[PDB]
Amino acid sequence: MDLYRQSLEIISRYLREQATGAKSGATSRKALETLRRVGDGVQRNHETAFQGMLRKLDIKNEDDVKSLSRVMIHVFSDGVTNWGRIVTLISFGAFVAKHLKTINQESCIEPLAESITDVLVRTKRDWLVKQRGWDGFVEFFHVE
């Protein structure tokens, strides 16, 4: 609750808007705004690595989308955590959501956002709380 629900609201709004191309109070609005700026940047600056990762995952059916969590928890959870990696996790989610629309699996975009939220909140809860959650995310990307 609260941190999970807020995270689910931000990630699912961002994935939905990235796929379609269309568009806790102020924190969620600010988080979406920062995520649109930084997230879109990451996707442009790492299109090559994101395309190569997308090819290795080879998404054809809805069983392929459900199998993403297995790679996701291990890859994301390994190493040191920082806001840069959280953005990469979410931006690659938006990149996968765009290809889901392309292959007529648009309905598996909301469960994808929920899978991303499970990996983020269930592996990094303590770090997120100490970093002031989504408010900490907004001020970390405030300047530049």
Ligand X SMILES: CC(=O)N1CCN(c2ccc(OCc3nn(C)c(C)c3-c3cccc4c(CCCOc5cccc6ccccc56)c(C(=O)O)n(Cc5cccnc5)c34)cc2)CC1
Which region, judged by CB under 6 A, interacts with ligand X, from 11-19, 68-76, 98-106, 129-137?
A: 68-76
Residues within window 34-93 making contact with its own copies, judged by CB under 8 A: 53, 56, 71, 74-75
User: Would you count residue 129 as binding its own copies (CB under 8 A)?
Assistant: no
Could you give the string, one character per residue 25-44, with x where binding to ligand X holds by CB under 6 A and - elsewhere? -------------x---x--
CA–CA gap between residue 102 and residue 106 (Å, rounded): 8
User: Would you count residue 116 as binding ligand X (CB under 6 A)?
Assistant: yes
CA–CA gap between residue 113 and residue 32 (Å, rounded): 14
User: Would you count residue 108 as binding ligand X (CB under 6 A)?
Assistant: no
81, 139, 100, 85: which is closest to 15 by C-alpha? Answer: 100
Among the listed residues 31, 87, 100, 109, the single contact to ligand X using CB under 6 A? 87
Distances from the Cα of 100 to the Cαs of 23, 38, 43, 121, 125, in angstroms? 18, 22, 16, 23, 28
Residue 49 touches which of its own copies, Zn ion, ligand X, none (CB < 5 to 8 A by kind)?
Answer: ligand X
